[PDB]
Design a protein around this ligand. Structure first.
Ligand SMILES: *CC(=O)NCC1CCN(S(=O)(=O)c2ccc(C(F)(F)F)c(F)c2)CC1
Ligand SMILES: *CC(=O)NCC1CCN(S(=O)(=O)c2ccc(C(F)(F)F)c(F)c2)CC1
Ligand SMILES: [Cl-]
Ligand SMILES: [Cl-]
Ligand SMILES: [Cl-]
Ligand SMILES: [Cl-]
Ligand SMILES: [Mg+2]
Ligand SMILES: [Mg+2]
Ligand SMILES: [Mg+2]
Ligand SMILES: [Mg+2]
Ligand SMILES: [Mg+2]
Ligand SMILES: [Mg+2]
Lengths: 228, 10, 228, 10
């Protein structure tokens, strides 16, 4: 790859510069290079990888929704341009999923790390499901559900109910239920038990991550208000 | 309003 | 080019979709294609071209200033990454300047259009001067000054003092004086006479552009307050 | 504060 000649530490350092410069494509390229050195990622490095690709794919999703709305509210130009953005978004999702499957998801390592990568697999299949249609679609929805569910099982076994990976996973799985799988009840049921169990075991908040935890709890509460 | 997912913050 | 097979009207229509989707690289590519059909641009199309490339180059300039500050406040990684962003910014400026010289700046046409393209030439040489150093630098500063000055002469001859191209040009020329040429007095003198002459001939505000005019007048006043 | 140039708005 383009990054193959650069030392892993320099790739990590440049990803941090790119984050500061808000060059998120560059940051994602740097972290792809770092992953491809074949060593596992630390929590800080996982955060870099997450932030980079989510920023890239988030702008693609927002563009896609703008074009998709113009297309629905209606020449071939809008469909053509929407299809171009769609194709680029699927390319980024395939890249992330390839990294997860080629390099990041392994049998061992941190349960923290295993849950995060499985959640990230679920997320990027969900982003593909937002733009999918045919035989592609139910296939994609099932890979998303499967990855989320495997992450759920590990997280409930190995992490306290306020842990931010566990919380963010449960929040995202419930969005999958509501927006992708058309299961409003499951989404409400998961978000409720997730919030309630976090509160019941509030004492497990961690000194170095409690602000992340309480933020997700609030977002769960926001979805429940919107869904009820 | 779309549902809210995990935000892209630190 | 990549756009050569697409009709000019479809390129314009897709540039407008890209603006709405905030895909400004795409929008700039579409407008480059449209320029390369070799017909002149209308005011609306010129606005598309201006907005697209300014958005692309503005994010590059902001990234460059972030990296450049980290570099000054201090391994080869920061310089290397700053040089990569610098090179990309110069590539975008060379592309704009090539379009202006190959296609857009002509002897005839709208004095409105001639002033705008000469101003745009001055701007993108100024963006190159922000990152230049050697024999490159004074050469670049002189091309910027020359293009601005030619635009000034035409604008004072052919446009009322509230016209927004005339105003925005004068505002940008005065920034060149202050930030690039190290001429604080010229910058203050130009901004003052520009504001005062706009106010003295306030009756020339146009129904379809007066909000642009009054916005530039305020920005002139802001620079004068900062510079005094 | 840097000087302000023509903004990129309509
Ligand atoms: C130790 C470790 O793995 N750290 C890196 C990852 C932590 C979990 N997240 S996440 O689940 O995507 C996530 C992202 C944002 C937030 C917050 F704070 F709410 F904004 C969160 F709680 C969880 C990825 C990095
Ligand atoms: C008729 C015509 O040429 N229209 C398009 C151009 C007008 C001038 N500008 S500009 O000089 O770059 C400019 C940009 C923004 C503003 C405003 F409104 F203040 F934000 C302005 F006054 C002038 C380019 C498009
Ligand atoms: Cl297209
Ligand atoms: Cl189990
Ligand atoms: Cl680099
Ligand atoms: Cl003259
Ligand atoms: Mg290495
Ligand atoms: Mg019809
Ligand atoms: Mg398609
Ligand atoms: Mg044509
Ligand atoms: Mg030292
Ligand atoms: Mg260089």
């Amino acid at each position: 790859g383009a990054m193959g000649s650069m030392e892993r530490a320099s790739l990590i350092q440049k990803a941090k510069l790119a984050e500061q410069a808000e060059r998120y494509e560059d940051m994602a390229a740097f972290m792809k290079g770092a992953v491809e050195k074949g060593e596992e990622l630390s929590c800080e490095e996982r955060n870099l990888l997450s932030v980079a690709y989510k920023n890239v794919v988030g702008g693609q999703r927002a563009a896609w929704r703008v074009l998709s709305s113009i297309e629905q509210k209606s020449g071939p130009e809008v469909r053509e341009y929407r299809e171009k953005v769609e194709t680029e978004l699927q390319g980024v999702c395939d890249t992330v999923l390839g990294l997860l499957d080629s390099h990041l998801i392994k049998e061992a390592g941190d349960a923290e790390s295993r849950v995060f990568y499985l959640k990230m697999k679920g997320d990027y299949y969900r982003y593909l499901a937002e733009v999918a249609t045919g035989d592609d679609k139910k296939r994609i929805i099932d890979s998303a559900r499967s990855a989320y569910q495997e992450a759920m099982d590990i997280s409930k076994k190995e992490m306290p109910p306020t842990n931010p990976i566990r919380l963010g996973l449960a929040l995202n799985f419930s969005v999958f239920h509501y927006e992708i799988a058309n299961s409003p009840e499951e989404a409400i049921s998961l978000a409720k038990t997730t919030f309630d169990e976090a509160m019941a075991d509030l004492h497990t908040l961690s000194e170095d991550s409690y602000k992340d935890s309480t933020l997700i709890m609030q977002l769960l509460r926001d979805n429940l208000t919107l869904w009820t | 309003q779309r549902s809210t997912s995990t935000p892209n913050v630190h």
